[PDB]
């Protein structure tokens with residue numbers, strides 16, 4: 001695909017991927033690059049930095065404030081008042097001023113922008129955070145946290161109960177709790193009233209409370225999380241903690257009867273001798289249609305239609321894709337169509353894995369379901385490719401240096417036989433070092449480097465009251481924390497479907513090392 005032919009396709013991640021391929025091979029000239037912004041679906045990350053080696057953007061500054069950016073720390077007192085206030089939106093700029101000018105500006109702004117005044121005078125002290133915390137300036141607090149994460153201080157009950165009202169609070173709480181940073185902030189957040197938080201914030205504050213062995217406060221946070229969470233899966237995670245902490249048997253019962261299939265509801269079913277949830281069975285009699293499952297542009301198109309279809313239009317697409325050849329698209333449509341109420345665990349291109357042992361089949365399928373929902377031409381925002389969502393670098397190393405496939409191209413990852421084969425091969429390497437399918441999942445998504453670093457710590461996946469569940473809440477990258485939970489549920493299910501059942505309790509026991 002030449003740049004001219006790509007330009008005649010709709011904007012999409014696939015079109016981006018292919019533009020990126022031209023760029024990394026140095027095939028986009030300065031002239032081709034001129035009209036190219038408008039041809040990129042998602043102008044973020046690698047494709048942006050690559051295009052910018054060819055055509056910098058010096059942008060962007062609002063024509064109105066242009067003259068404000070002609071001043072520096074040394075001339076800011078010569079600027080009009082509007083220009084003065086615009087420049088003071090940057091804490092680095094404020095930090096750069098000398099203290100006499102911070103004093104002068106603080107007076108200028110006392111009446112109309114006391115927020116600026118507080119930051120100006122704060123930077124005249126040796127601890128600006130302490131000054132801001134004494135004023136209980138909430139906006140100031142978050143601006144300082146965003147400026148530097150190194151500030152750490154005890155916060156009293158009144159102040160910490162004000163933080164949750166700011167949009168920055170949820171990321172602030174999450175970051176410092178899962179990174180184990182800012183201990184004085186963390187300890188202080190024990191005194192946040194559960195009434196003042198909800199949803200993810202409440203949940204993280206429950207995890208925080210467990211790390212300090214405040215199990216009652218933890219129960220109260222998790223219970224507020226349970227009552228406010230929008231998604232049933234997250235609600236289940238909170239109900240699980242409520243149960244582990246207090247062992248009210250109504251909590252476990254509610255979790256065992258959840259409509260969401262996840263590790264918590266599966267475990268609850270197993271603890272209460274409740275039957276395994278019903279898994280749908282999709283077996284279309286019709287064998288093929290016109291659709292090319294190997295065309296990534298056709299997937300981007302159909303995917304957009306499916307996501308924008310009303311309750312009614314799905315039914316038309318369901319019927320059209322009700323074939324063996326488009327099984328992955330059928331199940332994808334059905335999953336949306338039934339508003340996530342039914343459980344679909346398909347096994348497409350099964351011939352390519354039927355000779356592996358069943359445990360290996362389940363792990364493969366478990367990864368694929370989460371990675372791509374088995375869409376052969378799936379492309380991620382980082383341009384991970386195919387059913388098993390290989391990054392190009394690893395695909396080329398396996399494809400070219402290890403397996404030496406003749407005329408290998410990274411787009412071979414779009415073929416099911418290749419995806420399953422490379423997945424099997426990579427999963428072999430991970431399993432041999434890590435053993436648990438959870439740990440393999442973490443390493444598959446996040447790399448074996450971060451997984452090995454997490455498992456070398458003395459406070460992760462070791463023995464303890466609430467292990468291994470607590471450790472699973474403190475996995476330091478959000479995407480990997482989530483990924484491992486979802487893939488582990490998938491794994492349990494597929495082991496069951498393949499008549500190679502395991503108790504999820506056995507999985508959890510083998511996460512604790514000594």
Ligand SMILES: COC[C@H]1O[C@@H](OC[C@@H]2COCCO2)[C@H](NC(C)=O)[C@@H](O)[C@@H]1O
Pocket residue numbers: 369370371372373378379380381384389445479480482483
């Ligand atoms: C937390 O999981 C990380 C993986 O998420 C996948 O996204 C899930 C999607 C949602 O859309 C339908 C298919 O499943 C990513 N896959 C894609 C195509 O973006 C995957 O790359 C990522 O590792």
